[PDB]
Design a protein around this nucleic acid. Structure first.
Lengths: 159, 170, 293
RNA sequence: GCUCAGGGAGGACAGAAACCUCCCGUGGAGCAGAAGGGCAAAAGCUCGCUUGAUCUUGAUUUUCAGUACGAAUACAGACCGU
RNA sequence: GUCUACGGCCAUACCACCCUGAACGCGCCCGAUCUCGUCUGAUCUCGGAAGCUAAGCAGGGUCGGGCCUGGUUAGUACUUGGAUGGGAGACCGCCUGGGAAUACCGGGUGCUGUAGGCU
């Protein structure tokens, strides 16, 4: 059948990227994270103790407990049976960011600001994301030049 | 003109003895360096077992002593007195630090004892210049400068100007 | 011949390290283990005290980790000692102890704990740990940061450390790498450590050189004779310097001189100037070859 | 505290090979083994003394029927080493 | 305008050659008398300034290499879905969305938080 294993078929997955070998930056270590933050997992080759399994690459979860070294996260695993909001313990190095939640919070803050604004005026404000409509009719300007009558080309042998 | 912070001078003198024999010859070669300098030299051991030379792994063969100060100048004066102020082209290295080996030690001035034996050595002169602590210090290591490097032609013309020794071709 | 080592494939695949790692100043493997912080502390500022040893000055900075950069809140220097009145003894164990004590008293005066923890005025050398006195809140504490220096038996870094402990900076340490501590018999000698504090081993050898020969004595102490301080004055000078530290610990900044506003740097050469240079070279080479040949 | 594979210049015995320093050296050496990932003031080399391979309770993961066994994860509490 | 110390992002910062540097400032260097470990102050540590910007360091060019970024490659290769679509097979095209990587040619040779100074 197939071989069982923790690190199997991970020649390119957990390997270090191009020109990112050895020296590890200190950005993720000194910063902290609050409880319940959107964190997705990316593997790393320099970390040997407390590694994530190979079937937890690119999974988005939220933090439930904050310990010293390995913080916890509730990842939403989609196994063949059903969907489980399970809990695992991952160290600080396999933690990324996500600008989608930041843009969502800034959009909610801007919508609340526009809701508090013009309350004494009493005007309706378009708040929702209206999907892309077809274009409005407009006048096409032209002067001097004329559209060139293009004609196709004959066949020529490539090789 | 020339800066007095660019005065070339001798850093050290390496003096190694490799007789190719352990036991009595090694300690009688060490007694010669003990009578000459008056200090404990650093021994060296073999690399691996070779059936041609007849040595084994972890066996002391050679012994060296990097002599510094005025003692290195006096031993180099003995070497120039033996070699009568002449050298060869192949003795000089391309970097500048240069060595030459002698056959017997009775020409130096040391009295010959029949029990010790004849032991010669190599006078590996290492020259220098003020400003080679950045090359081996604790904080930073790096380049020291192209004009600060000492060349082979400059070392030969400095030796010919200072010690008045001819350099024969070959 | 041999193969060329510096190949273009080696230039493409050669990975460079960090800037401070190439400069060889920042040791990241020790620095990370110094700046470790638990994640359940929730933005607790970790203060540390950094000692740097120049040839004359002794830099004693206080830092705390921030994501943009570790901002320096205070720093003590050794060249500000002739302002207080320290003419001789610029870089020794006593100057390191006075710099650490001055930094500690300035730090406690800025945080507002000047009256509590007065400190060891009559310096003896005995061990006295910093214990939290009730009523008042918790005292300031930080961690040691020596740097690229081998901690042997006896160092000015440990003298500044002992000065910070006596001033009221609770930094954990042992009594092993202190001067006066014997390596073989292994006992801490307070009377021998007091000799290193006050400087009798320097003054006795100054008197020995004064008995022996004046040339080497002047060569070792050129401007120290010009400052006219006897070795009998050397003991009372630091006793007056301690009172000068106790008088005014805070420092006032210097008024800066007006800038003449000129660019000492060579200005950056543009594409038009580089093209004009290579055009003048390629135009001059052909006409020079035609004029010569 | 240091840097290796491998290579250049040399030296009475001494050569392709015994020993020495001068010049570099992203790893082409080494990290116990077949293999893979990874490692340069190190995870390689040498030193001082040590045994945290110590004891007592949980939770969680890997195959899994979310069942055992083995392995691993930081936490809870004292006690040691440099 | 610029230096030192503590730093983040980590080659627009990297390797070599050449040239210029007022003041602060970093360093070269003299010795071992003490603590210190070594044959030796060669390393570390300590005691200091006779001399110097020579070296170190700062800045700028190399019809420089490397790196970063656009065009070119190119609607080219490829690819989701569909058909009494063709072809003896081999293979190819059509409706519909998306869309490359070289070689080659243009531009550049770091931003930068705090504290302490020079002018």
């Amino acid at each position: 059948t197939n071989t069982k294993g923790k690190r199997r078929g991970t020649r390119y997955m957990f390997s270090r990227p191009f020109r990112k070998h050895g020296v590890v930056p200190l950005a993720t270590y000194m910063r902290i994270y609050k409880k319940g933050d959107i964190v997705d997992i990316k593997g790393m080759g320099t970390v040997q103790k407390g590694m994530p399994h190979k079937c937890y690459h690119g999974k988005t979860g939220r933090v439930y407990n904050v310990t010293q070294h390995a913080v916890g996260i509730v990842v939403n695993k989609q196994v063949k049976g059903k969907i489980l909001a399970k809990r695992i313990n991952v160290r600080i190095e396999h933690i990324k960011h996500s600008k989608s939640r930041d843009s969502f919070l800034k959009r909610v803050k801007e919508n609340d600001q526009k809701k508090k604004e013009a309350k004494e005026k009493g005007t309706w404000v378009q708040l929702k994301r209206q999907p892309a409509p077809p274009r409005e009719a407009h006048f096409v300007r032209t002067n001097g030049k004329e559209p060139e009558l293009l004609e196709p080309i004959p066949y020529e042998f490539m090789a | 003109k020339e800066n007095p912070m660019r005065e070339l001078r001798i850093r050290k003198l390496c003096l190694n003895i490799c007789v190719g024999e352990s036991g009595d010859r090694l300690t009688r070669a060490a007694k010669v360096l003990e009578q000459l300098t008056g200090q404990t030299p650093v021994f060296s051991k073999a690399r691996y077992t070779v059936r041609s030379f007849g040595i084994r792994r972890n066996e002391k063969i050679a012994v060296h002593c990097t002599v510094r100060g005025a003692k290195a100048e006096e031993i180099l004066e003995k070497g120039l007195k033996v070699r009568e102020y002449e050298l060869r082209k192949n003795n000089f290295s391309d970097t500048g630090n240069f060595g030459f080996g002698i056959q017997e030690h009775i020409d130096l001035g040391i009295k010959y004892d029949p029990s010790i034996g004849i032991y010669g050595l190599d006078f590996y002169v290492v020259l220098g210049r003020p400003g080679f602590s950045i090359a081996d210090k604790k904080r930073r290591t790096g380049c020291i400068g192209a004009k600060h490097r000492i060349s082979k032609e400059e070392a030969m013309r400095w030796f010919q100007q200072k010690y008045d020794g001819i350099i024969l071709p070959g | 011949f041999v193969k060329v080592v510096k190949n273009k494939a080696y230039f493409k695949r050669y990975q460079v390290k960090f800037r401070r790692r190439r400069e060889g100043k920042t040791d990241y493997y020790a620095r990370k283990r110094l700046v470790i912080q638990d994640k359940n502390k929730y933005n607790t500022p970790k203060y540390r005290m950094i000692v740097r040893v120049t040839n004359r000055d002794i830099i004693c900075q206080i830092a705390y980790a921030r994501i943009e950069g570790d901002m320096i809140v205070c720093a003590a220097y050794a060249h500000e000692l002739p302002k207080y009145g320290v003419k001789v003894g610029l870089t020794n164990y006593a100057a390191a102890y006075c710099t650490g004590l001055l930094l500690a008293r300035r730090l406690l005066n800025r945080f507002g704990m000047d009256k509590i923890y007065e400190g060891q005025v009559e310096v003896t050398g005995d061990e006295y740990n910093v214990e939290s006195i009730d009523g008042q809140p918790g005292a300031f504490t930080c961690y040691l940061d020596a740097g690229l220096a081998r901690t042997t038996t006896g160092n000015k870094v440990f003298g500044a450390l002992k000065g910070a402990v006596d001033g009221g900076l609770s930094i954990p340490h042992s009594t092993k790498r202190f001067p006066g501590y014997d390596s073989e018999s292994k006992e801490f000698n307070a009377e021998v450590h007091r000799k290193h504090i006050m400087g009798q081993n320097v003054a006795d050898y100054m008197r020995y050189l004064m008995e022996e020969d004046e040339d080497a004595y002047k060569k070792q102490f050129s401007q120290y004779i010009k400052n006219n301080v006897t070795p009998d004055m050397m003991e009372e000078m630091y006793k007056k310097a301690h009172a000068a530290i106790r008088e005014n610990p805070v420092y006032e900044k210097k008024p800066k001189r007006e800038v003449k506003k000129k660019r000492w740097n060579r200005p950056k050469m543009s594409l038009a100037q580089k093209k004009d240079r290579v055009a003048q070279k390629k135009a001059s080479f052909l006409r020079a070859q035609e004029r010569a040949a």
